[PDB]
Structure 1
């Protein structure tokens, strides 16, 4: 896995992306790595925001599936034409794989200006693939066609005329023990659609939020490398903020700051990290009544953004935001940790990352186990729609 290290790049807040080739001869493209979707989609038309796109007509190996796909997000939208071609990852494994590619022909608010990626690589499970679960996702194709273990791992590393560049590693097919310190800890994948986990306890600076633990997972908690922020359900969010406000109270910030809408700044290098509390999410363990905590620093949830005006200032954006769709453990969280997506054992691994950013007082941590007597169920059960209910899976 030597040759897989440092295979991710991107700009801060705009996504981590891996270099993939597709087609024959190999058309080379930067692709966003996104564990919260399950389609492989590539720009195949010209767009204002694309330097270069997938040209099917220039690939001998391309096969058209004569099917359309249409894929809305909450923010953003794209549609395209389904097909298959040869695909490989230069700084990934030394194989080539035939895989489904959605060729994107039109899109509203999908491609980001300056982000330098032209596709998305969803690494979640078939259930949430579009247009339905029979479109075999890339990673399924990869395992099915090669001897590559059903596992991958992500180390997303940290962040004045452009955004900051970011780096990381996507290790396909196992674990690289130079990427993490300390113990590696695993929570169950509750269910294979999203990388859904369960949170059992939340502490802000060692203080329990003291909420029914269902609230932490309403209506779901997921891990999404293609979300920047830590997203939390409204009730959890508001308590988080009350508590972060509390400890930060020496400092008085405009509404817009906490809404993720505005920047706050200090003199170059005088930023007072110590009035901001660590956050600790306890995740369900592999053993019943067991949990383990990941602790993340203010350095993670305050995101540095380089001001053009006062460039003699360090300025930060609050990267916790509100959700109506449950908890999303995005890049803000992952950036503390080597995260291991162990699909073979239906589990997610966390360890402290060999690269994670910290001050001299505190450190992001993975620390367990903890035990609760008669730990109730913290899972939510999403109301079943009749649409959903009427689907046949044969």
Structure 2
């Protein structure tokens, strides 16, 4: 039952959310980043300065070598490992054990994070973007094929001298109605690689950015629990920042802040949330000319570091709806029906004049790549 999966996620602000897993026999306990933006189950499997524990294949009686290496250079860094399979469970998840592919990371650069408290990544996206190629079955595919767990999972990410601690829930194989209020609205998964969606309109304090919607999805828009910020294509970013600056003009900030590098501080409970506007993303609906909107507050896009960082930033690889977006909502990754549902989260942070919202329908191609 889903009650035992509630609060099964933990994290530090800006360093992702992780779920506890065990790998091998006897079971080796590891904290694993829940990542909808990649498709490899990849776990530290050798000593590293930021790892205080790692996967030791030699200690597992059930480990099987696939006799194949994997090398994954990526923009910000890289990881490299060796492929194999082993038994995998999620203690506070479905009561099942599955044989899954595991990339045992032997070498990496700027991949692991100092103090994050996770030792690997659970890529929940689709085979198309798996490394080295799409023949390496992702964890969730193996889980569904090997067990009777329904082809669906949902994420409630709650957020918040030491980085603030965050919590949330990953409900595997269904939807926990206690985790949200109001209605669930669904946007189609445009293609099964990333969790790609289409944004058809963007509003800052009710004011339409009035861009050709192709810009919003140039060259794609994805939902990514493995990204902290709301990331926007350059032209949309600039337009968004312009509008946000204007709405909050009363107070004045350094452009280092708007560039998401500098933090700004008020002291304990004086933060002027009301001076910052709400942001609405309209997502394509299940019905052609129909859309719905998710609206987030400054409490979501200014993330605590008294002090905050502007968690909206520029992207050259399309829109990324990261934690900043997801923390307002209960997000259903309905793989079986090729759609992503959004509803107001029971845990989303807000005040007594505003609240995050999911609302539809609104009547309204925008697909780019």
Q: Do the structures match in fold with TM over 0.5?
A: yes
CA distance in 2, matches of 1:233, 1:52: 38
CA distance in 2, matches of 1:280, 1:219: 20
Cα shift at 1:76: 2.3
Aligned with 1:52: secondary structure?
Answer: coil
1:270-301 Cα shifts (integer Å, max 9, x gaps): 11111110000000000110000000000000
Cα shift at 1:252: 1.2
1:367-389 Cα shifts (integer Å, max 9, x gaps): 000112xxxx00002xxxxxxxx
1:204-227 Cα shifts (integer Å, max 9, x gaps): 000000000000000000000010
1:137-175 Cα shifts (integer Å, max 9, x gaps): 00000000000000000000122x211110000000000
Aligned with 2:85: secondary structure?
Answer: strand
Aligned with 2:228: secondary structure?
Answer: coil
Cα shift at 1:268: 1.7
Count of residue pairs the alignment pairs up: 367
1:5-36 Cα shifts (integer Å, max 9, x gaps): 00000100001000000001101100000000
CA distance in 2, matches of 1:88, 1:76: 29
1:45-79 Cα shifts (integer Å, max 9, x gaps): 00000011100001110000010001122212110
Note the 1:293-332 alignment, pairs <5 A.
293-304=293-304, 314-332=306-324
CA distance in 2, matches of 1:3, 1:138: 21
CA distance in 2, matches of 1:113, 1:323: 24
Partner of 2:32: 31
1:162-201 Cα shifts (integer Å, max 9, x gaps): 1111000000000000000000000000000000000000
Partner of 1:351: 343
Residue 363 of structure 2 corresponds to residue 380 of structure 1: no
Aligned with 1:214: secondary structure?
Answer: helix
Greater displacement, 192-201 / 259-268:
259-268
Aligned-residue Cα RMSD (Å) equals: 0.6
Aligned with 2:269: secondary structure?
Answer: coil
Cα shift at 1:328: 0.1
Cα shift at 1:105: 0.2
Unaligned runs of 5+ in 1: 305-313, 382-394
Cα shift at 1:315: 1.0
Partner of 2:153: 152
Cα shift at 1:266: 1.2
Aligned with 2:266: secondary structure?
Answer: strand
Aligned with 2:178: secondary structure?
Answer: coil
TM-score scaled to structure 2, two decimals? 0.99
CA distance in 2, matches of 1:322, 1:18: 29
Greater displacement, 99-108 / 265-274:
265-274
Partner of 1:221: 221
Aligned with 2:362: secondary structure?
Answer: strand
Say whether the 8 Å CA contact 2:159–2:165 is kept in structure 1. no
1:226-255 Cα shifts (integer Å, max 9, x gaps): 100000000000000000000010111111
Partner of 2:118: 117
TM-score scaled to structure 1, two decimals? 0.93
